Amino acid sequence: MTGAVCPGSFDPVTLGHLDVFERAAAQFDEVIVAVLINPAGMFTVDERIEMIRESTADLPNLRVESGQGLLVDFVRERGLNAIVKGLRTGTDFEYELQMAQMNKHIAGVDTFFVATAPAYSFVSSSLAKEVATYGGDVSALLPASVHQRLLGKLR
Amino acid sequence: MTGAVCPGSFDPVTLGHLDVFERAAAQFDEVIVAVLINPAGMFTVDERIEMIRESTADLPNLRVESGQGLLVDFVRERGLNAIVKGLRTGTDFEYELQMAQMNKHIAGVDTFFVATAPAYSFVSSSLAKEVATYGGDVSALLPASVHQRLLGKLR
Amino acid sequence: MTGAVCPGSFDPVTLGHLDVFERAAAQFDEVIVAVLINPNKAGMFTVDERIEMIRESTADLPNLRVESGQGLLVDFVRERGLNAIVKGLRTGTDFEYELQMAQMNKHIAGVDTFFVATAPAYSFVSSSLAKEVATYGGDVSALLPASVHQRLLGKLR
Amino acid sequence: MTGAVCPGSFDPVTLGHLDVFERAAAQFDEVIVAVLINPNKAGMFTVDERIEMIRESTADLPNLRVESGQGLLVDFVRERGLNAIVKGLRTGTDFEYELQMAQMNKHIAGVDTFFVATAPAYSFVSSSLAKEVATYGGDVSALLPASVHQRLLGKLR
Amino acid sequence: MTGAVCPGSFDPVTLGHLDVFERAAAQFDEVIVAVLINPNKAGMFTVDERIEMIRESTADLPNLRVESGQGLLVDFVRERGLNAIVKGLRTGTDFEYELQMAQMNKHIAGVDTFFVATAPAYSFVSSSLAKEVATYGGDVSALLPASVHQRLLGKLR
Amino acid sequence: MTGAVCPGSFDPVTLGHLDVFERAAAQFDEVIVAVLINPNKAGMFTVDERIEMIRESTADLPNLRVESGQGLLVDFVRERGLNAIVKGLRTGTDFEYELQMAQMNKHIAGVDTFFVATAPAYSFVSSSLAKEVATYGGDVSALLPASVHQRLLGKLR
Ligand SMILES: O=C(O)c1cc2cc(F)ccc2[nH]1
Ligand SMILES: O=C(O)c1cc2cc(F)ccc2[nH]1
Ligand SMILES: O=C(O)c1cc2cc(F)ccc2[nH]1
Ligand SMILES: O=C(O)c1cc2cc(F)ccc2[nH]1
Ligand SMILES: O=C(O)c1cc2cc(F)ccc2[nH]1
Ligand SMILES: O=C(O)c1cc2cc(F)ccc2[nH]1
Ligand SMILES: [Mg+2]
Ligand SMILES: [Mg+2]
Ligand SMILES: [Mg+2]
Ligand SMILES: [Mg+2]
Ligand SMILES: [Mg+2]
Ligand SMILES: [Mg+2]
């Protein structure tokens, strides 16, 4: 009965996030995507959850839930003690390293990092929103569903 | 039926390696420690395997095997497609990132990185050997068994 | 024929920026310094002040011109018939964040980015740190062109 | 008579800070801990509370004293007859913004900066992360001096 | 007439190298690929084989030519009337040893270095890792030009 | 009372090293430059040559002395009644490798390590790169003390 939690804001979910979800779902029996409620973003929590659910329909062992507060409490309250996070740079590793060590210290929760697929090395929710705001084409970087929803928030 | 391979030379295995093994064994159903045969080291392959087996007796779902050649072939020939590796720095992440992306490309094998326990952040097989060679006390950094064997190779 | 764009907010321009401008001007037929203006947040200097400070310290570069813009950098570049950006870099961390933006710029518009290592003497000046040091009275006269230093002190007083 | 200044906001002081203070006091005749007063961002503890938490935690360091200050750090250092800063570091990224600042401080005032690696056990603690964890009920008592932990529980009630 | 030199051992040339060559040839009037001859470490391919592999892969770049050389790179560059080097980069660490070399080359000979980010798809390929993977039977054909892959299979037999 | 050890192979000493020596000598009562000799691999310069080059360029530092040693640095430090190492750092990568050794040194012997950022003008000189550039004829006269440069050229000829 293995399992891991994939946390983030996912505003919106990108193909880089989806790649991490698919890799986590292939290596753990149960994956929970943890969508942070952090009350300034573009999509509401419900919209973010729906976009992730739409993009993960081919992953039978993955579910999507929202939460607040300490990630380690979210993880432990579901009987798990592993986090799976995607990583792009060594700079990414250092700040995430501090949080991983803190999370292990306070709750015994482990963090596994997975390297980003090369094709999504430069994709982030924030950069995709910013580029699309000025009319740049990000359709190759986002799930097809997410892309239409993004066009709608801008127009 | 989840599983991961933890590769290295382990010459000798340190408490930093053991920490990674224990974390992998807690999150995957099956863990295989892959001891590289790379024919200049201090211990023979058989001695390295025995030291790891001695230090992992409390991990029922972990076994230790030797191998050569492409790590991805070792992994795939055992029905698995995940590697678990310990990481200390962002510099660690960058060279290991290149190998992880190559391994995914050529064999579909994924790599999960886990941050080192803070207490073992500075321990490496090479630095422990070098310090012990000049008489420094590394007993707090190595499994109790390994420590005696190391004293024997030097004296 | 060849050309590159050197972008930044240049609020104000530093000697590190000027070094980059001079290196780009020596290697490309034309260089455009693109002064980024945020229509929502004013900097310390207005657009005309930023441009004046750059022009005064680049008068010896005949193939360099200065223009302002906003929004997507790759549109500024392509509308001028060019497809190269030149940017200065001080460290490995600068390289990772700038890396993301360079790969996005090539993906969305085919525009290439060339990075050049700062001259050592200017490794540590940034517009933001020069402003913060000067705000609390530190001497930054050797890090800014003559066209900048006293205008900066006047803004602060 | 040698000496160094250890600057920070210390809101609150952590065991990582204390480890740096102890190592500085062991190697310099005089150490001054400089507590930054920022008239903008007012943190969780007042400057007086922060000074008292540091004094309790450093009671066994006779050559270390605690003072508050404002503005340019190198002015604080030189006003006390010193020309050295001692700061703790955790990562290579830490070394990057801090290296820019150290070179700037050497350039503008001739003040030197010595960096020391955090003890491994305290490498993941920071004032900000400790407060955030404690706000949501996590146990950070192994990462803070005993008296800080008591005061921090009070501020959260 | 602008120009730049693209140096390396290219043993063998990869698609990451080729991407850099194409971007340099698009932005400079003349590009010289400089193939290093090292009388000590003799790699897998002779210098002539390496030049021919590059020429096959760059047949559509008319302003790019391939030459071999030895010793100090900045002497090779200045002997050809140029003063710019173009190199591809992958990581922040890459930027570190390469930044030291670029500053040294600027200091000793006035030669500038422009760095370009690898295309994402080729960011994990290197000559050395490709050879190692191919030696043990891994498939690196998507990472090398077609003619390189054929020659590399031959050397392994 | 206070003191620090500045270790290295100094084969040969550079102006970056001398900058570190001067900064340590201004902040500690005594400084010992510890010249590391590998009894198994000779460097370019013998131990007496390395020491002579350092002494000639540190004659204005009355509280600095030069001694050779081998093996564990922490034994050299402790046998002299000291427990501080001072080392220069150029980049974030330098900080990670040196980090490992500083934490091991504190673990096995209680010896602290203080790092100081190189002066910008010497950010890019290393003994190894100066030797390699000089080997192929490049001009490194401005990166080495007078006590070194012509002795280096003589070794190479
Ligand atoms: O990044 C975090 O701190 C975080 C993300 C998150 C998601 C949840 F669903 C609950 C708590 C969280 N904390
Ligand atoms: O690091 C490697 O390349 C490697 C380690 C290893 C261990 C094995 F058992 C087999 C192949 C390997 N390759
Ligand atoms: O950094 C940018 O995104 C940017 C800089 C810039 C300068 C211009 F003139 C126009 C658009 C820009 N965008
Ligand atoms: O980091 C700073 O800018 C800073 C810290 C500090 C502390 C003092 F007590 C006085 C000035 C300061 N400046
Ligand atoms: O990297 C170098 O040192 C180097 C590469 C190279 C290529 C040439 F053709 C000539 C000299 C070189 N030096
Ligand atoms: O870098 C070292 O390990 C080292 C430097 C050194 C210098 C001495 F004089 C003695 C031992 C040393 N060890
Ligand atoms: Mg993102
Ligand atoms: Mg190791
Ligand atoms: Mg700037
Ligand atoms: Mg802190
Ligand atoms: Mg290569
Ligand atoms: Mg050196």
Residue numbers in the entry:
A (entry chain C), B (entry chain C): 1 to 39, 42 to 157
C (entry chain A), D (entry chain B), E (entry chain B), F (entry chain A): 1 to 157
Cite, word for word, the article reporting this structure:
In this study, we explore M. abscessus phosphopantetheine adenylyl transferase (PPAT), an enzyme involved in the biosynthesis of Coenzyme A, as a target for the development of new antibiotics. Phosphopantetheine adenylyltransferase (PPAT or CoaD) catalyses the penultimate step in the biosynthesis of CoA in prokaryotes. The enzyme catalyses the reversible transfer of an adenylyl group from ATP to 4′-phosphopantetheine (PhP) to yield 3′-dephospho-CoA (dpCoA) and pyrophosphate. Further studies on M. tuberculosis show the essential role played by the coaD gene in mycobacterial growth in vitro, confirming the potential of PPAT as an antibiotic target.
Screening of a fragment library of 960 molecules by differential scanning fluorimetry and hit validation using X-ray crystallography resulted in the identification of 16 fragment hits. These fragment hits occupy four distinct sub-pockets in Mab PPAT, spanning the entire active site groove of the enzyme thus providing several potential starting points for drug discovery. Although the corresponding prazole fragment 1 occupies sub-pocket I on Mab PPAT, the indole fragment 5 preferentially binds sub-pocket III, as do the indole fragments 7 and 12 on Mab PPAT. Fragment interactions at sub-pockets III and IV coincide with the binding mode of Mab PPAT in complex with PhP. Therefore, crucial contacts at this part of the active site, such as those mediated by Leu72-73, Leu36, Pro7, Ser9 and Glu132, were recapitulated by these fragments. Sub-pocket III is seen in an occluded state in apo, and native ligand bound Mab PPAT structures. Whereas fragment binding results in an open conformation allowing further chemical exploration of this cryptic site.
